[PDB]
Amino acid sequence: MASMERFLSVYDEVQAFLLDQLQSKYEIDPNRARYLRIMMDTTCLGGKYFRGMTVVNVAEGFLAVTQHDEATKERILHDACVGGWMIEFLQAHYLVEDDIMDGSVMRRGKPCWYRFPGVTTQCAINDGIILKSWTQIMAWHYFADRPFLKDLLCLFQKVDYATAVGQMYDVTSMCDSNKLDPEVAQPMTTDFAEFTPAIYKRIVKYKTTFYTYLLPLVMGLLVSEAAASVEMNLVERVAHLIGEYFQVQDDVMDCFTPPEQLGKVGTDIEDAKCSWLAVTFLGKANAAQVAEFKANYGEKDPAKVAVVKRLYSKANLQADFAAYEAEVVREVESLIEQLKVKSPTFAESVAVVWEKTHKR
Amino acid sequence: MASMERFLSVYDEVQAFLLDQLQSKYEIDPNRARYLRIMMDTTCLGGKYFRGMTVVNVAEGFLAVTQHDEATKERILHDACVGGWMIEFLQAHYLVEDDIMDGSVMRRGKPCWYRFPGVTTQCAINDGIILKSWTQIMAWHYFADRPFLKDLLCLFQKVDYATAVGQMYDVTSMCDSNKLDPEVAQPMTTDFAEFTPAIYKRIVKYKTTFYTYLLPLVMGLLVSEAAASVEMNLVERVAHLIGEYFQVQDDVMDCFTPPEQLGKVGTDIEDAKCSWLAVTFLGKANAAQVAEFKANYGEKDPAKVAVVKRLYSKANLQADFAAYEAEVVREVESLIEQLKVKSPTFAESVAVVWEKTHKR
Ligand SMILES: Cn1[nH]c(=O)cc1Nc1ccccc1
Ligand SMILES: Cn1[nH]c(=O)cc1Nc1ccccc1
Ligand SMILES: Cn1[nH]c(=O)cc1Nc1ccccc1
Ligand SMILES: Cn1[nH]c(=O)cc1Nc1ccccc1
Ligand SMILES: [Zn+2]
Ligand SMILES: [Zn+2]
Ligand SMILES: [Zn+2]
Ligand SMILES: [Zn+2]
């Protein structure tokens, strides 16, 4: 059975389990069950399933080199699919809530969930809470007797937390740290002194890399009972590196990819985000350019946004990106090589992860 | 050491642990650490700590009748305080998010968190996410080697889920079930056919009773290694009963307690909530009264809200409340008696829980 079909069948299984349990144990009625079914499909389906499928990929890698009964192979694959879905549902939680937080309009060419006419923010916040609770219901049901249950919950827990910490880092990235105060409305930074590579890296490391690359990799090891075949510090390092790279790409696209292609109208400039473009622009700009940046950034006014886009174009940031790219290639290759010492197989899964990110 | 002082010291300990771990492991800076410290205090402190203190109370009950080394008594009490804080932080999560969801103004005589000038909804949603992640960080750290860790996480998990399901039941309670559809903006019910005792009970059972009464009781049993001294079905029944009663009281107060006393301006009528007053009014009203209710309920207009308040006054709902109260007294006493069969001590903790609710 091909990986994607297995993964998608498990979605149907898991959905049916969750909705059946709401009827038998939580006194739900059919109309609310239908609402939740539609919520799950709309928020969890329709992406590329990169994260969930990485869990499946890692597990398949181990199966190819490990002796097992056929029933055991199927069990490990079912586990990897459920675990993949846990990550996809955790992402869905964060997308729902983030879209609300940011007042976002679209996501993947469709309205944000909260904007659906029969949803509203009042329900959507709670819907996003339910998305994440479903991750736990899945784990407790499908993995109840599994030897990796503890380590899987503890890891999941840490990644979730890191993610929420990263969201805080993100939404506060255009404030001056020394001015943060719940009592005082937060001015946008005037100096941009905190738009540095190191500050940027911290945002991205927590907000994206733990759930997008670390969790899928390590969950595939856990459901494979293979975490002792890897040096965990190398897994962390490679995950944080590829994940950073993934975000820089996302930041570039926000500014330069046509809205129809992107699935949304990017607003990083208007939102004054600490993006890779802004940090790298401020890293090479002259005094006059920095001044023109400060006068136009973080403003909804389209004339000012176009001034910022023009400043990025004239600044030839494509060249800084090529250079960053080349350095990421060196380091990712270095880590992959290091991972071969203890597990060729896992090194190869990381290679696959890298190819799917590198050239996308 | 008195229970409240122990409980409050543990708060300081747990806060310090969480903020220290954010500095040493999550790369946090001092200003964001301060923001989170202020968030925790503002959202978790200042209530009566009924829920957290119930865990401590149950545990103290067992200590009085069980042989242990002094160090063990202290360990069990420390555990009960951490576990109490887990519940208080879970409530804080839900209050933060619910206040946002409902567009609430005040809570306990202070502005809702999201309304603080340097917070905003964009941060507050995430803050509420962090509140709940902190429950898990506490459990994994303080209870890592504990024999009850599994059962405690699994229970916690189920209660959290039940709560989010109850929130869905609540926010959808003024819609016609058969009209729920994410594609279509939801009209308020015109018939009120779903304002029944049984539908009401389901809302309250999930939205409040699991986290307010069941979880504190059962967490006190778990940290005491005493869950085999009780019949769990009796614990559930008594928890659901007292919790229902607690909510009916809350519903009455929303309408009739002066705003300064309540800590907020109650808006159940304007929000068209399925309250105990509305269900009991519709249960005794004549045709003309029902018609006047339908014309005025669920409308911000103060003239219409005063018409609804007047209809409740003329309907002498105090008498239905006395009658309900008397029946709750019978049943709670019956369950307490039943609980004495296997544990006098735990029966007595439930009595204390009841006295603190009954006459408050
Ligand atoms: C363009 N420049 N050259 C490198 O080698 C790295 C960067 N910028 C960067 C800063 C923070 C995170 C990721 C990339
Ligand atoms: C201005 N130009 N037009 C596009 O479509 C993309 C870019 N520049 C770019 C910046 C950083 C990395 C890669 C490309
Ligand atoms: C007033 N009436 N008499 C009872 O004995 C109970 C109710 N009403 C009620 C309905 C749903 C939940 C809780 C109370
Ligand atoms: C109208 N009246 N004035 C108050 O202050 C309270 C009530 N009535 C009431 C309704 C149900 C239960 C208890 C009291
Ligand atoms: Zn965001
Ligand atoms: Zn982006
Ligand atoms: Zn609410
Ligand atoms: Zn209320």
PDB file of C-alpha atoms in Angstrom, chain B residues 244-358:
ATOM      1  CA  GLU B 244     -25.007  21.814  37.823  1.00  0.00           C
ATOM      2  CA  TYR B 245     -26.171  23.516  40.994  1.00  0.00           C
ATOM      3  CA  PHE B 246     -23.161  25.808  40.979  1.00  0.00           C
ATOM      4  CA  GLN B 247     -24.015  26.925  37.433  1.00  0.00           C
ATOM      5  CA  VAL B 248     -27.696  27.536  38.196  1.00  0.00           C
ATOM      6  CA  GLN B 249     -26.530  29.868  40.924  1.00  0.00           C
ATOM      7  CA  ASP B 250     -24.157  31.578  38.480  1.00  0.00           C
ATOM      8  CA  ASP B 251     -27.016  31.961  35.983  1.00  0.00           C
ATOM      9  CA  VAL B 252     -29.290  33.502  38.637  1.00  0.00           C
ATOM     10  CA  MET B 253     -26.630  35.950  39.728  1.00  0.00           C
ATOM     11  CA  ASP B 254     -25.897  37.042  36.108  1.00  0.00           C
ATOM     12  CA  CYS B 255     -29.401  38.510  35.971  1.00  0.00           C
ATOM     13  CA  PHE B 256     -30.034  39.615  39.581  1.00  0.00           C
ATOM     14  CA  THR B 257     -26.700  40.424  41.420  1.00  0.00           C
ATOM     15  CA  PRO B 258     -25.620  44.097  41.259  1.00  0.00           C
ATOM     16  CA  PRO B 259     -22.771  44.552  38.822  1.00  0.00           C
ATOM     17  CA  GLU B 260     -20.283  45.782  41.553  1.00  0.00           C
ATOM     18  CA  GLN B 261     -21.000  42.634  43.584  1.00  0.00           C
ATOM     19  CA  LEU B 262     -20.827  40.268  40.558  1.00  0.00           C
ATOM     20  CA  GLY B 263     -17.443  41.719  39.266  1.00  0.00           C
ATOM     21  CA  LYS B 264     -19.056  42.416  35.875  1.00  0.00           C
ATOM     22  CA  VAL B 265     -22.226  43.651  34.046  1.00  0.00           C
ATOM     23  CA  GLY B 266     -24.086  40.324  33.254  1.00  0.00           C
ATOM     24  CA  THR B 267     -25.190  39.999  29.576  1.00  0.00           C
ATOM     25  CA  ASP B 268     -26.846  36.446  29.451  1.00  0.00           C
ATOM     26  CA  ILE B 269     -30.145  37.977  28.294  1.00  0.00           C
ATOM     27  CA  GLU B 270     -28.573  40.073  25.518  1.00  0.00           C
ATOM     28  CA  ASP B 271     -26.401  37.101  24.482  1.00  0.00           C
ATOM     29  CA  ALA B 272     -29.523  34.925  24.411  1.00  0.00           C
ATOM     30  CA  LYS B 273     -27.885  32.282  26.626  1.00  0.00           C
ATOM     31  CA  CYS B 274     -29.607  29.057  27.472  1.00  0.00           C
ATOM     32  CA  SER B 275     -29.688  30.005  31.129  1.00  0.00           C
ATOM     33  CA  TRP B 276     -31.430  28.330  33.956  1.00  0.00           C
ATOM     34  CA  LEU B 277     -33.733  31.405  34.295  1.00  0.00           C
ATOM     35  CA  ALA B 278     -34.787  31.185  30.625  1.00  0.00           C
ATOM     36  CA  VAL B 279     -35.394  27.428  30.641  1.00  0.00           C
ATOM     37  CA  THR B 280     -37.326  27.565  33.934  1.00  0.00           C
ATOM     38  CA  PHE B 281     -39.330  30.624  32.710  1.00  0.00           C
ATOM     39  CA  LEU B 282     -40.275  28.794  29.542  1.00  0.00           C
ATOM     40  CA  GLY B 283     -41.247  25.797  31.649  1.00  0.00           C
ATOM     41  CA  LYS B 284     -43.954  27.714  33.566  1.00  0.00           C
ATOM     42  CA  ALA B 285     -44.988  30.632  31.303  1.00  0.00           C
ATOM     43  CA  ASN B 286     -48.345  31.053  29.654  1.00  0.00           C
ATOM     44  CA  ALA B 287     -48.747  31.740  25.877  1.00  0.00           C
ATOM     45  CA  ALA B 288     -48.716  35.566  26.298  1.00  0.00           C
ATOM     46  CA  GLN B 289     -45.563  35.496  28.495  1.00  0.00           C
ATOM     47  CA  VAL B 290     -43.725  33.223  26.044  1.00  0.00           C
ATOM     48  CA  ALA B 291     -44.600  35.659  23.240  1.00  0.00           C
ATOM     49  CA  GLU B 292     -43.343  38.640  25.212  1.00  0.00           C
ATOM     50  CA  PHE B 293     -40.126  36.640  26.009  1.00  0.00           C
ATOM     51  CA  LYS B 294     -39.536  35.892  22.322  1.00  0.00           C
ATOM     52  CA  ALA B 295     -40.003  39.547  21.410  1.00  0.00           C
ATOM     53  CA  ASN B 296     -37.430  40.830  23.880  1.00  0.00           C
ATOM     54  CA  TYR B 297     -34.786  38.154  24.513  1.00  0.00           C
ATOM     55  CA  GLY B 298     -31.365  38.160  22.955  1.00  0.00           C
ATOM     56  CA  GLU B 299     -31.281  41.952  22.173  1.00  0.00           C
ATOM     57  CA  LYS B 300     -28.775  44.507  23.437  1.00  0.00           C
ATOM     58  CA  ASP B 301     -31.544  47.226  23.794  1.00  0.00           C
ATOM     59  CA  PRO B 302     -31.929  47.954  27.535  1.00  0.00           C
ATOM     60  CA  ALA B 303     -35.709  48.423  27.357  1.00  0.00           C
ATOM     61  CA  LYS B 304     -36.012  44.793  26.034  1.00  0.00           C
ATOM     62  CA  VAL B 305     -33.595  43.402  28.625  1.00  0.00           C
ATOM     63  CA  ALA B 306     -35.652  45.071  31.393  1.00  0.00           C
ATOM     64  CA  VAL B 307     -38.832  43.492  29.884  1.00  0.00           C
ATOM     65  CA  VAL B 308     -37.061  40.057  30.191  1.00  0.00           C
ATOM     66  CA  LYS B 309     -35.974  40.802  33.818  1.00  0.00           C
ATOM     67  CA  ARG B 310     -39.496  41.894  34.701  1.00  0.00           C
ATOM     68  CA  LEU B 311     -40.897  38.657  33.122  1.00  0.00           C
ATOM     69  CA  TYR B 312     -38.541  36.625  35.341  1.00  0.00           C
ATOM     70  CA  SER B 313     -39.540  38.599  38.472  1.00  0.00           C
ATOM     71  CA  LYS B 314     -43.298  38.271  37.845  1.00  0.00           C
ATOM     72  CA  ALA B 315     -42.782  34.535  37.130  1.00  0.00           C
ATOM     73  CA  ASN B 316     -41.588  33.933  40.736  1.00  0.00           C
ATOM     74  CA  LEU B 317     -38.602  31.800  39.634  1.00  0.00           C
ATOM     75  CA  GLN B 318     -37.263  32.068  43.282  1.00  0.00           C
ATOM     76  CA  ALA B 319     -39.808  29.333  44.036  1.00  0.00           C
ATOM     77  CA  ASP B 320     -38.635  27.040  41.271  1.00  0.00           C
ATOM     78  CA  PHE B 321     -35.084  27.678  42.588  1.00  0.00           C
ATOM     79  CA  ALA B 322     -36.022  26.737  46.177  1.00  0.00           C
ATOM     80  CA  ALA B 323     -37.586  23.572  44.857  1.00  0.00           C
ATOM     81  CA  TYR B 324     -34.519  22.702  42.741  1.00  0.00           C
ATOM     82  CA  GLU B 325     -32.317  23.504  45.712  1.00  0.00           C
ATOM     83  CA  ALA B 326     -34.289  21.148  47.957  1.00  0.00           C
ATOM     84  CA  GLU B 327     -34.007  18.337  45.456  1.00  0.00           C
ATOM     85  CA  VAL B 328     -30.187  18.927  45.055  1.00  0.00           C
ATOM     86  CA  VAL B 329     -29.916  18.724  48.904  1.00  0.00           C
ATOM     87  CA  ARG B 330     -31.654  15.321  48.831  1.00  0.00           C
ATOM     88  CA  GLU B 331     -29.585  13.919  46.067  1.00  0.00           C
ATOM     89  CA  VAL B 332     -26.217  15.308  47.279  1.00  0.00           C
ATOM     90  CA  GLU B 333     -26.894  13.899  50.733  1.00  0.00           C
ATOM     91  CA  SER B 334     -27.854  10.556  49.167  1.00  0.00           C
ATOM     92  CA  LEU B 335     -24.567  10.420  47.200  1.00  0.00           C
ATOM     93  CA  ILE B 336     -22.481  11.450  50.218  1.00  0.00           C
ATOM     94  CA  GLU B 337     -24.087   8.635  52.144  1.00  0.00           C
ATOM     95  CA  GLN B 338     -23.328   6.187  49.392  1.00  0.00           C
ATOM     96  CA  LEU B 339     -19.621   7.418  49.307  1.00  0.00           C
ATOM     97  CA  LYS B 340     -19.295   6.608  53.115  1.00  0.00           C
ATOM     98  CA  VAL B 341     -19.584   2.876  52.280  1.00  0.00           C
ATOM     99  CA  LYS B 342     -16.073   2.772  50.775  1.00  0.00           C
ATOM    100  CA  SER B 343     -14.579   6.067  52.214  1.00  0.00           C
ATOM    101  CA  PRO B 344     -15.852   8.140  55.055  1.00  0.00           C
ATOM    102  CA  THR B 345     -12.932  10.509  54.564  1.00  0.00           C
ATOM    103  CA  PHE B 346     -13.627  11.194  50.907  1.00  0.00           C
ATOM    104  CA  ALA B 347     -17.374  11.477  51.704  1.00  0.00           C
ATOM    105  CA  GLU B 348     -16.488  14.174  54.153  1.00  0.00           C
ATOM    106  CA  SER B 349     -14.356  16.075  51.525  1.00  0.00           C
ATOM    107  CA  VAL B 350     -17.388  15.977  49.239  1.00  0.00           C
ATOM    108  CA  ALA B 351     -19.499  17.363  52.125  1.00  0.00           C
ATOM    109  CA  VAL B 352     -17.075  20.226  52.455  1.00  0.00           C
ATOM    110  CA  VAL B 353     -17.276  20.824  48.713  1.00  0.00           C
ATOM    111  CA  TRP B 354     -21.047  20.840  48.991  1.00  0.00           C
ATOM    112  CA  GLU B 355     -21.169  23.293  51.976  1.00  0.00           C
ATOM    113  CA  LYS B 356     -18.878  25.695  50.174  1.00  0.00           C
ATOM    114  CA  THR B 357     -21.124  25.611  47.103  1.00  0.00           C
ATOM    115  CA  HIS B 358     -24.607  25.346  48.758  1.00  0.00           C
TER     116      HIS B 358
END
